[PDB]
Amino acid sequence: TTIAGLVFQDGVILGADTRATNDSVVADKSCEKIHFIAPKIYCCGAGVAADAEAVTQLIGSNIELHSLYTSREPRVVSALQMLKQHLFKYQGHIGAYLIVAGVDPTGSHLFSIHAHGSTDVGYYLSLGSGSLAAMAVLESHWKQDLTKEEAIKLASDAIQAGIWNDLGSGSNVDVCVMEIGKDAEYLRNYLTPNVREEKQKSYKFPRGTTAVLKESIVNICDIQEE
Amino acid sequence: MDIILGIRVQDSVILASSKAVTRGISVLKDSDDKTRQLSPHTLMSFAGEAGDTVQFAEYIQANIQLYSIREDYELSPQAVSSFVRQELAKSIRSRRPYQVNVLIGGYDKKKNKPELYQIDYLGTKVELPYGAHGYSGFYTFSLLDHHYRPDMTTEEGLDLLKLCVQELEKRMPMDFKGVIVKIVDKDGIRQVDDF
Amino acid sequence: TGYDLSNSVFSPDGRNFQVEYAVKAVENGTTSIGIKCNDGVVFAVEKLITSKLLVPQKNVKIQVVDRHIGCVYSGLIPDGRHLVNRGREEAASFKKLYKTPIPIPAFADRLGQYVQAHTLYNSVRPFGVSTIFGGVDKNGAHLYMLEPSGSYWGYKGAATGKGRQSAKAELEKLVDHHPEGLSAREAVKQAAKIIYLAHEDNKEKDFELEISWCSLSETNGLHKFVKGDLLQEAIDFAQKEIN
Amino acid sequence: GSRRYDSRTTIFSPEGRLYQVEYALESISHAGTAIGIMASDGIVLAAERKVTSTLLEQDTSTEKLYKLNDKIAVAVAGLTADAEILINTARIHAQNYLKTYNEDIPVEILVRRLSDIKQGYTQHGGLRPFGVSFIYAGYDDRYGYQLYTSNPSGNYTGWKAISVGANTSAAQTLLQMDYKDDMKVDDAIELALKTLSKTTDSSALTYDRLEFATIRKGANDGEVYQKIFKPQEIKDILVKTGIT
Amino acid sequence: TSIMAVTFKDGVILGADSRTTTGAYIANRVTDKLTRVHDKIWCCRSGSAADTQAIADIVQYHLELYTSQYGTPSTETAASVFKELCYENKDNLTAGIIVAGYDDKNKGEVYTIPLGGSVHKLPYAIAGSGSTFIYGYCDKNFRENMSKEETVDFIKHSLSQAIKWDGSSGGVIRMVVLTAAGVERLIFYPDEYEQL
Amino acid sequence: GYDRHITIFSPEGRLYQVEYAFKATNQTNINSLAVRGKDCTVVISQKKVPDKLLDPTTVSYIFCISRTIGMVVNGPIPDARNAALRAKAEAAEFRYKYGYDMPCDVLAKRMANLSQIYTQRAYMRPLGVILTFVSVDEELGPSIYKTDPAGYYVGYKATATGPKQQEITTNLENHFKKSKIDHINEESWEKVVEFAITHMIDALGTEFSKNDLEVGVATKDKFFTLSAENIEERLVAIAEQ
Amino acid sequence: NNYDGDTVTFSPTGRLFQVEYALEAIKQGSVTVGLRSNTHAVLVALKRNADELSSYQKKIIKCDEHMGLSLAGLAPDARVLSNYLRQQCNYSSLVFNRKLAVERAGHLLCDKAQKNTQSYGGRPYGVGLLIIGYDKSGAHLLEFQPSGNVTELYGTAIGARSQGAKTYLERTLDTFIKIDGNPDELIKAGVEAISQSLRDESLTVDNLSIAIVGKDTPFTIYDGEAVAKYI
Amino acid sequence: SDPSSINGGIVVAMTGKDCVAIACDLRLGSQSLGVSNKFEKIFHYGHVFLGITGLATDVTTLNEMFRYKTNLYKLKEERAIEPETFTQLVSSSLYERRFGPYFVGPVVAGINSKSGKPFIAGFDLIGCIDEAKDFIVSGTASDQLFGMCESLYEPNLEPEDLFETISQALLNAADRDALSGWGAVVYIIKKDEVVKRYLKMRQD
Amino acid sequence: MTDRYSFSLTTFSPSGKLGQIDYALTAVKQGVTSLGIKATNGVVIATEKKSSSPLAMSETLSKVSLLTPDIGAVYSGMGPDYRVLVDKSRKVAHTSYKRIYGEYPPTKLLVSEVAKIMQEATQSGGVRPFGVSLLIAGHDEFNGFSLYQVDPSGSYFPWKATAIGKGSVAAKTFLEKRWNDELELEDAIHIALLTLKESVEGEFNGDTIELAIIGDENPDLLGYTGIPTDKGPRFRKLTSQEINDRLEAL
Ligand SMILES: [Cl-]
Ligand SMILES: [Mg+2]
Ligand SMILES: [Mg+2]
Ligand SMILES: [Mg+2]
Ligand SMILES: [Mg+2]
């Protein structure tokens, strides 16, 4: 996994690759690692995929109920506090490593969150097996007062470094842009640099190739009336 | 406990279970009956960890007998096996699991059919024409695969069972002291006293 | 009607009659007072000698909480002890967590919230005591008085029990005649006088005087009982004033 | 303390009656009449709604007839909210049984379980009983078609035909007069509707004031089918039987 | 980590490096290890980042609730709340915390709470992996009642050496000055402190 | 007639215990007032020290709940302090869990929900208090939110509570009918306090000394109470024009 | 009247009627006397029989080697409170290697009785106790009432007709306090005191119960022919 | 010792044009010992199909659990559960046992009755959802299945072509796994008909 | 300090009446009028903002509440009881449905959960019934648009149109004359405003009326773009200006 976050002029942006791997095999080539917490709060998930997804959904549910209760739009610091306190309680057994970013009435924010419940503040961050490749790119090119067009470029460049140089990361680039005074734009498959080439042969079989012992109709219907 | 075998023929289920009880160095008994009657037409044989086997079997027996009295009705073999499976499946994630493998031989009076169910300590249930637990299947299944027919009589089933026991007595290192054999059919449960 | 039969029931007035009935038990008790002085507080109480068989100086009524707070009360004596036992637990847990000894206003609210909690449910009875308490903390001397309702305020002087009207009038004179303040040793003498004057309401039986004090200069900010020569000096001063 | 305000819901009267059960039964006597009739080839459940309103959305409405599983249904008389608490418990018991034994729960076992829950509220806990009477219509392979009733006491009994709710005295006399043992479902449908039409407190019996259901063995190829009647289908059977 | 707190004439100054490592990888090179539990009571954190953040958040909650009821807490009170959490949960915590604060009555005070959950009131304290390399330097150069400028130099020189020798320490030197005048943040970059 | 002793419905659909808790509210015989400026929220309350033996500094019905939130109470002091302690605990817990300061309106809602529970659950009595919460909220600006024993709460442009609340309310109503704005158009809180005191004097028909009043002021990032000498300066300015 | 249905309810004059009714059970109970000097402390108790076939109900209970009490009222409540005292004496010895002070024993009994007067469901204790003991500050005598009030005294009496004995001790105060190093004379004074509370019946061998504790004397109870000496 | 490979077995699911296919082997074993050749691993709740590989006691337990839950769903909702909703129910149910999980590899397959859209999904043992457009694989020969599917699969196959593709993927994957085989079943699922076919294969 | 009311405070009287439920219904009757009307392409719910003082800001008091993105609620009776029910209803929509199935509950099932909470206050120990009737309007994919009433007993009924509270008898007669099965949402809003004018004494405008709809999906209110399947909430509360526009065409 390669996930990244960075801040720009009047916003914050998240990036993630789309490969899920169990051991050495690619289970999924197009999975979404950028999770929805609130309309303008998003979370990149690394580590154990189920844990990251589950923890974001629970906090996202509680954030929504809090937002309804208080009649206020949710804050990133609330999502951060709820996530870290939950993760700390389980002493790292929920193996979620997260980059949380969002816009709220306070402004734009970017935080990282580790499985044991430590948090960090940053202008640019990266997590997962591709973090070192991604951070090399961010340390080379990140600057203050980046424009949105520059920021999307840098974020996708950071994720690409992970895709190419990390075996744990691969496939496509997902991006989410959160700008102040605007709707967040979720750009799934922002980049598609790994389409498979056309195959040499067609492996479609002639009909009747497979040997069949028995055929039967499965009744998937409710009991009928006469 | 060691060897428990089961074979479902045309009109009955036959269960064969070893007589030996070994506690480490010595054979303490050579006439042990590793079975409980759950209902008039349902028999359960068992093998596994000492103590747990009998404790489990008698606990099942009590619950099925309770059901019989409450409803004035005998549960089908399928229903009994599902109840037994759930108790073992519950057991495997407990503080201390029942280490017990069972065979349930029953005659379904509604369908007029014999039925044999094999359930291991994990709660892995299978309905079979013949079954075993532990190493018993390793010696006997090649003979059963060869000779078994679904239309066998009870006498043919017993003869095939003798061949299985003879093969066990030849190639197994442990002396299991022969087997008690019991037949489950439409008339109920009876023991074959000469085997 | 029936509003006075159960605790925590509002009458049509907006009153809790069971708390008002607890006040009657307080009014029936012996007189106790508190005087705030320049660098501390003085507590005094009337102890009715029911019989000659009572051992003198033994049935001690004033109680210490922690090492710096004194508590005295009028009404049902067991209820007062129960409240002080709670106060000691509150003071212990405060010091356990925060290291510093419990400040007097903080301590006052701990007792206050506890007493108030016994007016919230019909499964409990209100406290049948008014408690005068105080001591010295980092911000100086504090004297409080706490009622059965859970109500409390800070005081220059405080009095409760059967002779409270008499005592209050005497305390009001001291406040007017000493705006600059009263010394700790003066307050002990005046406390003795006030209890002796307040004893006209309980004049049938004779009594025993008991005084305690916390003072920054006289006791190092610790609660101590007035004993021996200092107690006898206060009794003599009091006896001289009544005659 | 609190003792002062306790009604004491679980006590005997001097005559040996449970006050709250008897008063719950009085409540149920004002509820819309429900009728169950058992035939050789099926069971009929008919019930009268008390809504009595034009603007009520009838096709999405359910106050009387509820499905417990594919083989068992209930008709409700009394507090609908109380009934839904019990209904959901019965639905869970049926699935627990199915999970344990891998067989559909026999009708009586489900009925006994619910009746035992009702009984508990009359003997312990200090709570009011459930103000509900059920008619259970069901099928299993042991006894075939079965009708039961349970009331707030937790007592249950089996029936060939039965009524609960309003005018049960009058309704039970009419059923006792025209019921026969060799009766069929189509005849039982007609008896149920005729009985409701005579006992009703309303001026006339119409489709919008009724809920109707049948359990018939006679699903295609020997399977049992529950049929909760739609508003248009209740209207048709009323014209067929000659009531409107 | 290299952290210290030093009392001086006008109050107290907390100092820290900004490096957070996962093994040999620097996970964050601009960490803020100087954290606020009350207006003029701060702490320096070392050990498990999860644990020290969890503790500091709980303390901040306790002192906020203290303040609502009893007014401003003393530095000793803050140290006591830290100690209570560290001592009672010693089996499940890896936390080394220096507590520093300014009262007007007590002036500058420093308390160090090592792994065991003991408390030690000191004129100055050093902690974290990099502190081992400056025990000699700090002992030789510390004086009581230094000026603000002298104390800033003492901390700057001390942590400069701690950073130089300890791989686990590095980045910027952050400082927080606590006096009657208020709360002042200071930052010192590598090109400044490395040439000292 | 036990429907009047516990919180269950009477035949008219009323909760008499709730209604009687409202009557306990006026037992102190104290009137409070709250108004909003541009940058601030001011709350004033009568202060009566009838006994000369009392320490007047300890007699208060205004509470500092959090740094941003203040609360004035109309009702007996034991219930006032019960509500004060709980509101303080709730405000601190909120900040710990959700990472930002509890808003004034959210605290009001929380305390109102707690009050609602005492009207529904039999074993708990209602508190005989009306709670008026004030702050300068970071999102909503100057805020007044009031809670009562029924569990009702609402926001206010300005409000009054006590025996003579109607006289104060109508006085405030008439002012805002002229100005046609939801607040006191004034820069400094000092002048908003002077407005509050002036309009209480006009409404109640009584003059005040420095010891007869108690004042609380909410500004951005702090709520504080005025001393007797701060109030005296306020009273001097009123008299001088 | 309306305010005596339970212990949790004050009357309009501030009284707790259930506690007062518990106090009444003590007045119905048989007389027991307590008195002390500087060296020793004595309990004397008139035991009550059901009839001529029955035994005489025991009145005195040992709590430790240096402490014990006599009862008047509900005997099962005395058993509960004396068992609690035994445990508190035992806790003090095991944990602190310390004999429990008699004054502190009174404070513990006061607090235990109080909890039953402020909570719903419970009832007050229906017994009065006279605790004697010898600790580090010498001889002590306590009187316990189930209201919670515990009182340290030179002498007292509780039970039916106890006022006669209590008046005698009030007169004799100056004499019996000086009976130091003479256990027999102190018991004589207690036996003479309890005789002022007798009507119709007199002190027989199975009627009288005496206990003593002192400087070099463990708490010991005398019944039967052991008390014939004092008749 | 490894619970996911004691009993053995495999499931594969594929999408086609207006159809889905799900298939499984029939082996149940105790490590090396073959125990049953009739252990079906595909179940259905209305029109939603669920394949489950892994520890056989959990396969049976989870089937009984989802039958329970989809029965109650239907009674309350008054409609059959859809594949998308059921997928979330499987994920929820697995994750609630996060720290004592069922050792299984579920696969969902079905057609949404309202939109007509073919749907497949796979999960890890704690409920992480893989919602693939093309195919899902599971079991002890999942590597072999990934290899077959990745080459044999092409999009928008007609039902009778999809049958051949999924069958050949399963069979040849199973023949390279010791713990799979002993027979096989293929379900071809269309919007309102489902055909079930048992395949002939080598019995070693 | 113990809760000793472990017994029912609602019990059957000799006539079979549950007194506390009847008395709760009397409290609902005293409450301000609220109504609901179902159209072919939507549902409307409406009520009067009865302001307790002119100094009070009635915008801060929401009588019409969002429960889920596609479900809204209004009441008549005791306001505090409603507020806590809305809190519980929002939470139960998540805990007993969304966290299990990954989608919001359908209208009828959320109503069923609210009904259950209200039933339990009618039978559990030491509690009185809720003194409110709720009108819950909502949409879901398989059931379409729907409108439900929920009473203090826990009973609920589906309606084409209805009214509760003060002038409900007169309002229901008005709705019977006007309602048909071919109403568009704008027609239902128009009828809602006409009906509600009869029960209102004083001012009748957008500031004194609260009105919300369940209608088309609002992608503008969603807050984000990039997921085609999420098209936005069907619940929408009408503004003060939007109400006043329709009062000119009245
Ligand atoms: Cl709440
Ligand atoms: Mg370094
Ligand atoms: Mg209440
Ligand atoms: Mg193979
Ligand atoms: Mg092989």
Side-chain angles (χ1 to χ4, degrees), chain F residues 89-100:
Chain F
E90 293 289 339
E93 192 191 47
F94 188 98
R95 175 58 187 76
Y96 175 72
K97 286 186 182 175
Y98 309 109
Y100 72 100

Short mmCIF file of all heavy atoms in Angstrom, two decimals, chain F residues 89-100:
data_model
loop_
_atom_site.label_atom_id
_atom_site.label_comp_id
_atom_site.label_asym_id
_atom_site.label_seq_id
_atom_site.Cartn_x
_atom_site.Cartn_y
_atom_site.Cartn_z
N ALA F 89 -18.57 18.90 34.36
CA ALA F 89 -18.18 17.53 34.00
C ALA F 89 -18.48 17.20 32.53
O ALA F 89 -17.64 16.60 31.84
CB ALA F 89 -18.86 16.52 34.91
N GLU F 90 -19.66 17.60 32.06
CA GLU F 90 -20.08 17.38 30.67
C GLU F 90 -19.23 18.17 29.66
O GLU F 90 -18.93 17.67 28.58
CB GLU F 90 -21.56 17.74 30.48
CG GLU F 90 -22.54 16.83 31.21
CD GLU F 90 -22.66 15.43 30.63
OE1 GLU F 90 -22.31 15.22 29.44
OE2 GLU F 90 -23.12 14.53 31.37
N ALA F 91 -18.88 19.40 30.02
CA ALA F 91 -18.06 20.26 29.15
C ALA F 91 -16.62 19.76 29.01
O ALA F 91 -16.03 19.85 27.93
CB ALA F 91 -18.07 21.69 29.66
N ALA F 92 -16.07 19.23 30.11
CA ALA F 92 -14.73 18.65 30.11
C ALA F 92 -14.67 17.32 29.35
O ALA F 92 -13.73 17.09 28.59
CB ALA F 92 -14.25 18.47 31.55
N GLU F 93 -15.66 16.46 29.57
CA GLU F 93 -15.76 15.18 28.86
C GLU F 93 -15.87 15.36 27.34
O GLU F 93 -15.24 14.64 26.58
CB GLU F 93 -16.95 14.35 29.36
CG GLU F 93 -16.94 12.90 28.90
CD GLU F 93 -18.24 12.16 29.17
OE1 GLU F 93 -19.32 12.70 28.88
OE2 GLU F 93 -18.17 11.02 29.69
N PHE F 94 -16.70 16.32 26.93
CA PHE F 94 -16.90 16.66 25.52
C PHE F 94 -15.57 17.01 24.85
O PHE F 94 -15.25 16.48 23.79
CB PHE F 94 -17.87 17.84 25.38
CG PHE F 94 -18.29 18.14 23.97
CD1 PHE F 94 -19.49 17.65 23.46
CD2 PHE F 94 -17.49 18.93 23.14
CE1 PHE F 94 -19.89 17.93 22.16
CE2 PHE F 94 -17.88 19.21 21.84
CZ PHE F 94 -19.08 18.71 21.35
N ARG F 95 -14.83 17.92 25.47
CA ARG F 95 -13.54 18.37 24.95
C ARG F 95 -12.55 17.21 24.80
O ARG F 95 -11.83 17.15 23.81
CB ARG F 95 -12.96 19.47 25.85
CG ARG F 95 -11.55 19.95 25.49
CD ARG F 95 -11.44 20.48 24.07
NE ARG F 95 -10.06 20.77 23.70
CZ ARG F 95 -9.12 19.87 23.38
NH1 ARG F 95 -9.40 18.56 23.39
NH2 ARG F 95 -7.90 20.27 23.07
N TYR F 96 -12.53 16.32 25.78
CA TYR F 96 -11.67 15.13 25.76
C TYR F 96 -12.01 14.19 24.61
O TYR F 96 -11.12 13.76 23.88
CB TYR F 96 -11.74 14.39 27.10
CG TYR F 96 -10.97 13.09 27.12
CD1 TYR F 96 -9.57 13.09 27.14
CD2 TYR F 96 -11.63 11.86 27.11
CE1 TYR F 96 -8.86 11.90 27.16
CE2 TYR F 96 -10.92 10.67 27.13
CZ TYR F 96 -9.54 10.69 27.15
OH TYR F 96 -8.82 9.52 27.16
N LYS F 97 -13.30 13.88 24.45
CA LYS F 97 -13.77 12.92 23.45
C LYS F 97 -13.72 13.44 22.01
O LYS F 97 -13.28 12.73 21.11
CB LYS F 97 -15.20 12.46 23.74
CG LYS F 97 -15.32 11.49 24.91
CD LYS F 97 -16.75 10.98 25.05
CE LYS F 97 -16.89 10.05 26.25
NZ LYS F 97 -18.30 9.62 26.48
N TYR F 98 -14.19 14.67 21.81
CA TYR F 98 -14.39 15.24 20.46
C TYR F 98 -13.35 16.29 20.03
O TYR F 98 -13.40 16.78 18.90
CB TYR F 98 -15.81 15.80 20.35
CG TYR F 98 -16.88 14.81 20.78
CD1 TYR F 98 -17.59 14.99 21.97
CD2 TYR F 98 -17.16 13.68 20.01
CE1 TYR F 98 -18.56 14.08 22.37
CE2 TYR F 98 -18.12 12.76 20.41
CZ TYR F 98 -18.82 12.97 21.59
OH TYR F 98 -19.78 12.07 22.00
N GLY F 99 -12.42 16.64 20.91
CA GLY F 99 -11.26 17.45 20.54
C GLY F 99 -11.49 18.93 20.30
O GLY F 99 -10.60 19.61 19.79
N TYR F 100 -12.67 19.44 20.66
CA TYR F 100 -12.94 20.88 20.63
C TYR F 100 -13.88 21.29 21.76
O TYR F 100 -14.56 20.45 22.34
CB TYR F 100 -13.47 21.32 19.26
CG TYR F 100 -14.89 20.90 18.93
CD1 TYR F 100 -15.95 21.80 19.07
CD2 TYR F 100 -15.17 19.63 18.44
CE1 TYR F 100 -17.25 21.43 18.75
CE2 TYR F 100 -16.47 19.25 18.12
CZ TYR F 100 -17.50 20.16 18.28
OH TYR F 100 -18.79 19.80 17.96
#
